[PDB]
């Protein structure tokens, strides 16, 4: 209840006073709420925590200290920076070898916070050699909670794509993830799949590593898993994978990924619909073979259905799917799309306030009309039937340079009589 007493009580030689002062410190989450940040950072309490973190044969002291540093590093980035300036990290790493499980777990927790702060802090913590000791903890005799914290730290390691995580670090993590992906717990699986998600969102290179880890055939079937969260995470991960090159996407496809999507396209959660239609919107942008692989899965009718009766986001992603298939697909493929009654719902989006969607739809229609030559009459009359031509004629206004210019180019080119 006093603001600064501890600094004297923690400097004593009586292990009870010191043990108690750091415990009453451990009560900081509530203690901190009353005073603002600055004063306690200035007076100097933090170094005191580290000094006492060094001394072994007194595990309670180390536990209370690492608790305090833990809850301090949870705050703003400036607070975590204040923690790392104390050079406390090598002492946490020293604590990773402690025989007391509570000390190890607390250290793993705090390192989790520090790593999760930012990419520079992450590269700092890796530069000291935390990855191999952390991964060495994975054993069939590990407690479940401690394992959950370990995986959490893995997720923090894989985050922050701005500077991507080090190559060697990922090369060390991936096998552990391949071991964790078979685990029975739900939360552990979730965190693992999110770690994969960040690894794949990093870029094409890391995606290629994930594919080289042989984990994709084990990841894909999770799309149809019972728990919704595993589904969401797996879908984001795989989608990031197919954001890459052609052959990589083809590796996703060869594991029979499309078979799971009919369910995902009809799943009650709106976010899963959105993310799945996003996925397919990346698939149609691939080569002709992949587009044909989408058509062969009977998925186009549900894509259009969501394009007509889905929410705004899913409608957007579906519009992207149609346009990508339009510029990438063959003539007979776009023909199949047309004979699936895609023109009316695809055109009914021209009335939205989002200029990007309008550019997508107009570009798609323009590409369709440029593609089909003899039936350009027929298709034109099709747009005239669904009233889309009226919408295009009223789109020629000053909302956007591209919408008007492209719009009237379409009109004059394909709709002159």
């Amino acid at each position: 209840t006093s603001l600064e007493a501890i600094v004297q009580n923690a400097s004593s030689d009586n292990q009870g006073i010191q043990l108690s002062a750091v415990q009453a410190a451990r009560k900081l989450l509530s203690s901190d709420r009353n005073p603002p940040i600055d004063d306690l950072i200035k007076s100097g309490i933090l170094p005191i925590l580290v000094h006492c973190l060094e001394r072994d044969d007194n595990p309670s002291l180390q536990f209370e200290a690492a608790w305090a540093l833990t809850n301090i590093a949870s705050g703003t980035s400036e607070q975590t920076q204040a923690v790392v300036q104390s050079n406390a990290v090598p002492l946490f790493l020293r604590l990773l070898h402690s025989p007391h499980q509570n000390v190890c777990e607390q250290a793993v927790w705090a390192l989790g916070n520090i790593i999760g702060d930012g990419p520079q802090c992450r590269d700092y913590v890796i530069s000291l050699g935390v990855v191999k000791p952390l991964l060495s903890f994975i054993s069939p005799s590990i407690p479940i909670t401690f394992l959950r914290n370990v995986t959490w730290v893995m997720v923090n390691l894989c985050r922050h794509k701005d500077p991507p995580p080090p190559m060697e670090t990922i090369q060390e993590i991936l096998p552990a993830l391949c071991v964790l992906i078979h685990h029975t717990d739900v939360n552990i699986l979730v965190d693992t799949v999110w770690a994969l998600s960040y690894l794949t969102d990093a870029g094409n290179e890391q995606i290629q590593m994930v594919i080289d880890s042989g984990i994709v055939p084990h990841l894909v079937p999770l799309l149809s898993h019972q728990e919704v969260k595993v589904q969401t995470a797996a879908l984001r991960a795989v989608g990031n994978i197919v954001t890459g090159t052609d052959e990589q996407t083809q590796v996703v496809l060869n594991c029979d990924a499309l078979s799971h999507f009919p369910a995902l396209l009809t799943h009650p959660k709106e976010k899963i619909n959105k993310e799945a239609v996003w996925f397919l919107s990346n698939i149609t942008a691939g080569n002709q073979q992949q587009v044909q692989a989408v058509i062969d899965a009977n998925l186009v009718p549900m894509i259009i259905h969501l394009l007509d009766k889905g929410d705004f986001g899913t409608q957007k992603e579906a519009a992207w799917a149609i346009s990508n298939l339009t510029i990438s697909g063959r003539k007979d493929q776009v023909a199949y799309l047309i004979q699936q009654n895609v023109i009316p719902p695809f055109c009914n989006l021209l009335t939205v306030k989002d200029a990007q969607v309008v550019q997508v739809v107009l570009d798609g229609l323009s590409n369709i009309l440029k593609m089909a030559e003899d039936e350009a009459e027929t298709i034109g009359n099709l747009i005239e039937e669904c009233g889309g031509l009226e919408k295009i004629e009223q789109l020629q206004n000053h909302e956007n340079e591209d919408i008007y210019k492209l719009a009237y180019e379409i009109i004059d080119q394909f709709f002159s009589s």
């Binding site: 989450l29 949870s74 909670t145 997720v155 969260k229 996003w278 990438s328």
Partner: protein
Amino acid sequence: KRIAKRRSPPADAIPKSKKVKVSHRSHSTEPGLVLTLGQGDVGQLGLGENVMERKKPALVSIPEDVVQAEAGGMHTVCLSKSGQVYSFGCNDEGALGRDTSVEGSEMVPGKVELQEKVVQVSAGDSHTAALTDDGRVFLWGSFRDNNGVIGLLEPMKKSMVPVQVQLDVPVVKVASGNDHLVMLTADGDLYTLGCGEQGQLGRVPELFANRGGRQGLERLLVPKCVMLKSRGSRGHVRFQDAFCGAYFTFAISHEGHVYGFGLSNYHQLGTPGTESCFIPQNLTSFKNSTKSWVGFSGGQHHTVCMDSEGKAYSLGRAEYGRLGLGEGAEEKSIPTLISRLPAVSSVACGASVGYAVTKDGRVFAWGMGTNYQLGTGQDEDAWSPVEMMGKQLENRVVLSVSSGGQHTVLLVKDKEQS
């Protein structure tokens, strides 16, 4: 021509970063052993299939050490050192959160179907709530009222297994009445959920009263804070601590003031009148500059509290010796000192009884002895704070105490000598 692949907008960032490890002065840390006593009709004593009753404390077999023990209405929940939760009692409403298909498995303690490191537990009439280290709250069982079942989170639906109360803010303390639950967060915000028929929620004023449809239940079973006009001050009123009576709730703020709300039919809220308090009324009966309130507890119609100096007070209904003041003293609406009590370390209340724990380790009981909750071995109603005695108390000190409907559970530790 081919278009380039599209990237995803950032997501909700579920695993976002640096989750806080909660700490609060209510978290029990010192390990101990569990004792039970009273009616064990449905196995809330955890002593065996053939054990129906114990009139003095008996030891319960737990494979690990126990850091906390709380006794529900007709069940009992223990929190082990390792973090796992053990439950034993009545599983008719799912308050145990584990498979009791095998008859006889509810009669003994069993490991709850949950894999977490739990730091706090709270148990009421028909429910059980756990608080993990990272701050997220689990809850299982069901709620009730003077009326039929009202569900747990989805109205008219009970839960047989632990279910997370998904909240963005970490929670530092959980506290349970009979059929309501309060959660004190780190930021000081105080969330409530459960029944509010008698106003034990505080955030649902006189605008309605027991709407027997899906409308009111739809508003009640969602965790929401209690907003208060801080009289000049911006933001909202913060809170330092909180406690749950049976059908009422108290809370201590940083300003030192004491708030409370619920049913005051027998003046068990310190209010002069029997009017129901649906608003967190500031209690003038507790306003004192010298006295600083630290510990609260309460039964279905009585209330026991304690100050920073160790003196434990009591108020509320007086029948059946639940106050324990003067061997038949009249009903009291104000906190009354019990001169027979030494320096009290912590206080607690049962259904119709009350328990005190002194700093030296002694435990005193008082109230209705129909269920032999008093530990005296006499069903006679005790009006005096009689000391509890038994062989399992020899050379041992009482760490904590909790009491429910037909039983009572203690947490004790061997003395430091030898």
